Amino acid sequence: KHTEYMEFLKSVPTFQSLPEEILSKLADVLEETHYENGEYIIRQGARGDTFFIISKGTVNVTREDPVFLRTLGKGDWFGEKALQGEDVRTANVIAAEAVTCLVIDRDSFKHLIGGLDDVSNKAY
Ligand SMILES: Nc1nc2c(ncn2[C@@H]2O[C@@H]3COP(=O)(O)O[C@H]3[C@H]2O)c(=O)[nH]1
């Protein structure tokens, strides 16, 4: 799996700009997690410690009745806001089909991903 993860991370513009040794560590520590259609991946208001990169499928993002914000797909990512400052989730993320996410915990994110301009300067 490590090699599959590497080839994938090297294909995503946000992450292909990272040194390959950092990508190798990410591939080492990430957890592959799977969801079915309609499954809540993140709930607004919860406290979070994980970052997600979509490696298969699509998700819907909604936010306080909730309003639809956008859909994200393979190579997109989400969950950074709870890792920036306060740890609260700011929106819901819901699987829109069979989804696989590569999940990175806070310990790894703060060292390997948090300084990336694409992520740190991400605006919606
Ligand atoms: N607050 C907000 N989050 C969004 C939006 N579009 C995608 N997201 C993602 O939805 C995620 C919910 O978890 P986080 O708040 O940690 O991080 C959020 C973002 O990564 C948006 O328009 N507003």
Residue 42 CB–ligand 1 contact under 6 Å: yes
CA of 59 to the centre of ligand 1 (A): 12
Residue 79 CB–ligand 1 contact under 6 Å: yes
Listed in sequence order, the residues at least 6 apart from 120 whose beta carbon sits closer than 8 Å to its beta carbon are 84, 114
- Span 1-124 CATH architecture: Sandwich (2.60)
To the question of whether residue 97 is assigned a binding role by annotation, the answer is no
HEC readout, 19-70 = CHHHHHHHHHHCEEEEECCCCEEECCCCECCEEEEEEECCEEEEECCCEEEE
DSSP 90-107: -SEEEESSSEEEEEEEHH
* Token pair recorded at residue 84: 């920036």
Residue 59 CB–ligand 1 contact under 6 Å: no
To the question of whether residue 124 is assigned a binding role by annotation, the answer is yes
Question: Resolution in angstroms for this experimental structure?
Answer: 1.6
**Burial 17-52, CB ≥16 within 10 A → b, else e:** ebeeeebeebbeebeeeebeeeeebbebeeebebbb
Q: Residue with the nearest Cα to atom 8 of ligand 1?
A: 78
Residue 81 CB–ligand 1 contact under 6 Å: yes
Residue 67 CB–ligand 1 contact under 6 Å: no
